[PDB]
Symmetry: C5
């Protein structure tokens, strides 16, 4: 279900940050490379049940070195996996930075959009390897929920309208996080171009919706997508 | 037996205690770790007469937390003693206190002024499931809320109830009054096997009028899974 | 005498919280019993100049194990004692949680109350041994100061009216903290019955005043009154 | 031959700095002999800098949360203050000190005082209290945007009310004010000495009631309470 | 040549990275430290040509800070790589990451809609000084600000500029656009030998209308002194 987790609804997504202890460096290189192989194997073990992508936060996001984006069909499996991961010789030297869960749904407001707008939505993004990745949690203010459907739909249309041309160079995904933690949404973006993403976010600061974002970022997680090997290789040499 | 006399009756203080495990715990020999566990298991059975204690694995679902206790007692001192004892153990000595919330269970304030039909559908209380997820959300209401008169508040809670009832099928709930015991008014606690239902349930309640009056909503929002204490500690042995 | 500090005006009061380090447990039972005895002896030295009461916060207040309520006639003496205490082998393993100073005054608004109301104010709370204790620091908003005397008096009269019948099961004391730290008042309560105290606070959430408490708690310190030996005794075993 | 000493505590164009430190716990794991050696290292460093800058010391331990020690440093360049402070943190003692907080502000020509009545200027010439080992208070302050949007005359009038409410406390309270905007996250640094803290409390309550007060977006946070003392008395405590 | 090609041109990512030195570092032998220092020094020489890196002594001027890097690059990856390496070094291992802020340098948005005369006075490139103080102010504007239409924001910036120009006497400036890379919209950077002017400059700008729209202003406000890395690190060897 490689293609079935990154795309389908009813799939729980989790974002897990870690910071590496200093004492980790007090360990011998041979010991750490052993620790590295342990993790690679722990992940392969959980293959089939869950999907796991890794992002390097060291040097781009404050107080964080590593991030996991984990998709699962139940959060219990994700829980177990993370407790196991944090149990490894490597994990034991990790301080948990942060943790956000949200489920993927079919869209609420999209059906009431123009046919032409839904067309431009069918595009699934740009072709790039090892892109930058941004994660922005969001809490909407109470005023927003007090609004009726028709109003929110229209605001979200302006949201869409302003953002669509950035699907040239930006992939996106949206998770509904309400009731699972202190936010309503988790937004995720991949791009090779951060100038575009920057402009993209500015444009959305100018729509009417934005004023309703009681929390915007905090934290704003910037990292770069890479295989877990490349990441761990940095933690051994 | 007495379990339902604590989990259901009013005049019962309830406590929510979070813990995170130190790193230095793993620099210990594995054999030392397993012995420490046995201390804890016995400490609980020792308190098994006076109080009730439930455990939740927060590791991997809640940031800066591995373990959680929900302790029911009819005096907080007994809850205090058990907790300082728990932290005095060799295991406890390697635990940082994450958070701590007290609240007593009371007679409902607004339910009496509801429709008769609404009171009947309330007698049903959630679903029976093993190893369920559990959520705890503390709440501080604003001064605006307290300034209101009963009828106004009662109507708001009635709308709250109305939107929530159809989720009472797949969600257990409990409510504690925390004002004056800590920096919140309410501790809300929920059990469910289905987290989307709980999610949909919360969205639903964001849309009633009460929600604007929730000055603090979560912070923290505690997600965990209910489990026997044994299952948890066993992880700290390997 | 002893009590001449718990009641009179011109008496500075200080509230000091501490959390015990973990490394303390990495110490031998021999060191700790020695360390405890040090503290017990230090306190007994100051027993003439100042008053010191002790509270167990472990298990009731997050990030706190012990609390001192120290009354003195000058903050200097309180300073000396506290700097000494933190200097002890035991103190070396305490993280300073928080610190609040406030002086006791004669009441400002009480004279402008009803004759019947002053009667019920002279009456004490209830006397019980090793009771719960709550400490709530309070910052008033600027609006509150802008109000005129007559206005503030009537508001505090409403406060009093709602609270007087809770003197059945609750002792109280109030300290004026403005300019000594980041709050205006320190409130302190003893009681055997926390359900009452709970109800007491709800009642006051409903008066007009409550809206003016910009800061209410943060932290709300819940503890139980105890002799210091009993408290430290736990930290030796 | 001195003079310059009070020429920093009084003159304008003089940067003033407030530096808090918290001592490590392991510092006490050192032998009493090791610490007193460490003390003198600091004491000499200070005497070395006695020409360039002025330094006062305050014991914050037991009065102010997360802080033991405070320096009030006056200099005519912050670099001299920077160097002295990095050096200070360089001593074996400093090596065991965590930098608590840091506030810079310059002493200026008063802005609003000139637009006061002549009688109000006279009572301002009046001095604080003369005392040894007094308590000392520091309160950083940020004014809200509303305040800056005002025209001068309006502000002058408010500060006149401020001054008027505060004047009778110059009997038992000394004061000094630093302009901190652009050097840190506050606009002003206020500093007070007194032997009587209850008077100071009253002094501050009074000003909570003027109109200016609503414009103080930040008032304290932190509020630093201490006692003024010779540096030796402080260092003597960290070994004995 | 390339020096000015990163400090002036657009499409250039700029990063601001703060570090504090751990205490356990002094328990290290001086021999160990000097070797550690040399490690850092060489790493920088390696990344030269690809990126620019400037250093600031924050020790004694900014709380919970000793050191700051300003890194200019045309990709943030190159900056990340350089920074993870730096924190990996024997010295870096003893550094706590204080903070991190990214922003791109752009061509001006509002300048064209200014008077021809205001554009004249802007071309000035500041004061001539070596080892100046340096100040960093991060900035987030409120929603009200974005809601404004172009013409209005431009007038506010015109008022901003007008009030600020006479401080190009003694102040250099640079501006970074930070939105979407972290929790702020702008990163402002200034150099000066005279801090009293910079202060007056900021007081002055606190009085225009734009200022009310600065929801976060500083927090942190980073004050330091510009210096070559050697002199800074040499402090940590003795
Ligand atoms: C190419 C970029 C983007 C596109 C095409 C896009 C499009 C959409 C669409 C079509 C929806 C409706 C989904 C639904 O009905 O639930 C939506 C929802 C949402 N978007 Fe985006 N968006 C983009 C960028 C962003 C960014 C940059 C942010 C925030 C930083 C963001 C935040 C949100 C949030 C919070 C919602 C759900 C709000 C609600 O349900 O009330 N989006 N987006
Ligand atoms: C899912 C099923 C739910 C049901 C059947 C339900 C129903 C009720 C009822 C009947 C009361 C009566 C209180 C009284 O009589 O004093 C109440 C109170 C309350 N409920 Fe719920 N609720 C549900 C979910 C929730 C959720 C999900 C939250 C918060 C996240 C919540 C927050 C509260 C709070 C804070 C109160 C106290 C109200 C006050 O005294 O101001 N409830 N609820
Ligand atoms: C049995 C309970 C209580 C009684 C009899 C009581 C009564 C009073 C009285 C008579 C005053 C007047 C002081 C004066 O005029 O100078 C006062 C002041 C005050 N009370 Fe209470 N109160 C009670 C509980 C509480 C509680 C539970 C709180 C807060 C959690 C509280 C907060 C305050 C504060 C902040 C003041 C200072 C008022 C001001 O100067 O603005 N009181 N109280
Ligand atoms: C105790 C006797 C006091 C006196 C005689 C006094 C008087 C004055 C005077 C005459 C000025 C004018 C300076 C100028 O024109 O720039 C001033 C400014 C100022 N004062 Fe005070 N004050 C006193 C206490 C306080 C206290 C206790 C605080 C705050 C806790 C305070 C806060 C300030 C601030 C922040 C300014 C800057 C001017 C402005 O608001 O823009 N003062 N004060
Ligand atoms: C001292 C000389 C200064 C000059 C000549 C100056 C000039 C300018 C100009 C012309 C712009 C807009 C560029 C454009 O039109 O695209 C700008 C942007 C900005 N400046 Fe300044 N400024 C100065 C100082 C400051 C200071 C001291 C601060 C903050 C403490 C500051 C904060 C900002 C901010 C937040 C922006 C972003 C405006 C936007 O694009 O929305 N400036 N500056």
């Amino acid at each position: 279900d490689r293609e079935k987790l990154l795309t389908e609804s009813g799939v729980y997504g989790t974002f897990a940050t870690f910071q590496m202890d200093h004492d980790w460096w007090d360990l011998p290189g041979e010991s750490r490379v052993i620790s590295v192989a342990e993790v690679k194997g722990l992940v392969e073990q959980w293959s089939g049940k869950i999907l796991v992508e890794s992002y390097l936060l060291r040097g781009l996001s404050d107080h964080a070195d590593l991030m996991f984006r984990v998709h699962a069909r139940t959060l219990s499996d994700t829980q177990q996996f993370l407790s196991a991961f944090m149990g490894t010789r490597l994990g034991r030297h990790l301080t948990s930075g942060g943790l956000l869960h949200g489920v993927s749904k079919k869209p609420t407001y999209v059906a009431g959009f123009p046919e032409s707008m839904k067309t431009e939505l069918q595009v699934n993004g740009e072709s790039g390897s090892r892109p930058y990745a941004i994660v922005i949690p969001i809490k909407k203010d109470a005023e927003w929920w007090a609004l009726d459907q028709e109003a929110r739909t229209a605001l979200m249309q302006e949201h869409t309208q302003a953002a669509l041309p950035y699907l040239k160079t930006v992939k996106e995904k949206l998770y509904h996080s309400t009731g699972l933690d202190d936010v309503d949404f988790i937004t995720y973006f991949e791009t090779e171009r951060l100038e575009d993403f920057h402009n993209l976010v500015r444009a959305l600061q100018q729509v009417k919706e934005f004023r309703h974002n009681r929390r915007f970022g905090h934290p704003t997680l910037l990292g770069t997508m890479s295989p877990l090997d490349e990441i761990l290789e940095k933690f051994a040499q």
